[PDB]
Amino acid sequence: SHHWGYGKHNGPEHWHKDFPIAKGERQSPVDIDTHTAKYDPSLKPLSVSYDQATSLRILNNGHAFNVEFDDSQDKAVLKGGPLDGTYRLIQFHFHWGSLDGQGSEHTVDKKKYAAELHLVHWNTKYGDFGKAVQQPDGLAVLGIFLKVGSAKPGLQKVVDVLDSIKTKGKSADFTNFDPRGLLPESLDYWTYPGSLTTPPLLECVTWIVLKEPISVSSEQVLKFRKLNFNGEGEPEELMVDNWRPAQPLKNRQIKASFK
Numbered sequence: 170s171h172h173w174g175y176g177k178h179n180g181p182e183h184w185h186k187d188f189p190i191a192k193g194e195r196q197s198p199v200d201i202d203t204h205t206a207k208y209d210p211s212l213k214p215l216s217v218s219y220d221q222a223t224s225l226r227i228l229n230n231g232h233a234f235n236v237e238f239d240d241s242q243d244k245a246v247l248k249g250g251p252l253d254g255t256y257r258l259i260q261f262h263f264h265w266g267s268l269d270g271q272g273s274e275h276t277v278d279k280k281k282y283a284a285e286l287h288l289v290h291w292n293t294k295y296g297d298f299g300k301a302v303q304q305p306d307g308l309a310v311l312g313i314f315l316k317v318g319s320a321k322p323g324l325q326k327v328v329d330v331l332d333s334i335k336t337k338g339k340s341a342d343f344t345n346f347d348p349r350g351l352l353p354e355s356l357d358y359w360t361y362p363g364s365l366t367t368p369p370l371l372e373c374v375t376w377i378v379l380k381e382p383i384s385v386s387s388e389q390v391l392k393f394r395k396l397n398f399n400g401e402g403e404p405e406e407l408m409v410d411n412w413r414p415a416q417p418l419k420n421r422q423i424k425a426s427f428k
């Protein structure tokens with residue numbers, strides 16, 4: 170069974186033994202060298218269409234928490250930019266640190282942010298998520314950096330439910346949440362071909378990483394850090410530092426949407 174995690178004994182340096190693609194040619198995350206990334210005029214406009222997003226539930230899966238959506242129809246979709254066709258929102262989750270100076274997966278000129286939000290979408294030409302992850306263009310992940318400063322009002326409904334999903338396997342109703350409240354003002358982004366950042370590490374993702382971070386409060390991120398990796402009644406292991414480090418860029422170029 171799967172026993173990977175984020176500790177010294179089962180963390181990112183161990184993953185390759187059960188998931189050999191860990192050492193592949195298009196792994197994520199990566200460092201974004203801002204000086205080397207080039208404006209690409211071939212990028213069509215990005216279209217984030219979350220008006221009809223239908224959230225359902227929040228789950229602690231023992232690695233992060235997922236806010237899950239109804240993806241049985243095209244209720245919330247991502248299109249445009251580097252993408253061909255229509256990608257359906259399935260869930261979002263975060264990666265974060267034990268302290269504010271680490272937590273993001275992607276880095277920007279080697280700078281680590283306090284956390285990173287991943288809005289996960291699957292290409293509807295493949296019919297279901299499980300089929301999509303087996304294709305090089307199956308998923309689109311919209312990544313958004315979090316810095317600590319002023320509170321993010323649209324994040325607070327998430328923060329407030331976390332005490333009800335402390336431990337692995339716990340879930341709670343999470344209807345009527347609007348994920349548009351987690352975006353920054355600007356949709357300027359970087360994009361490159363990569364992978365899932367957890368096992369199974371499949372090389373199925375078009376990454377779209379927004380340049381502008383969102384600001385969250387220290388109090389908000391401190392609440393993330395009270396979650397547990399463990400299940401109920403087990404010795405407490407705080408859910409912190411659930412991020413994979415940057416991986417080799419290899420034969421890839423990061424493109425910018427902006428001049």
Ligand SMILES: C=CC[Se]c1ccc(S(N)(=O)=O)cc1
Binds near residue numbers: 172174179184
């Ligand atoms: C107590 C020692 C760890 Se058991 C173990 C460790 C790592 C993995 S892996 N290759 O899936 O990350 C799988 C199983």
Ligand SMILES: C=CC[Se]c1ccc(S(N)(=O)=O)cc1
Binds near residue numbers: 289364365368
């Ligand atoms: C079979 C797939 C596992 Se579900 C999943 C979705 C997204 C990510 S991430 N961190 O790359 O956005 C990681 C894992």
Ligand SMILES: [Zn+2]
Binds near residue numbers: 263366
């Ligand atoms: Zn993620």
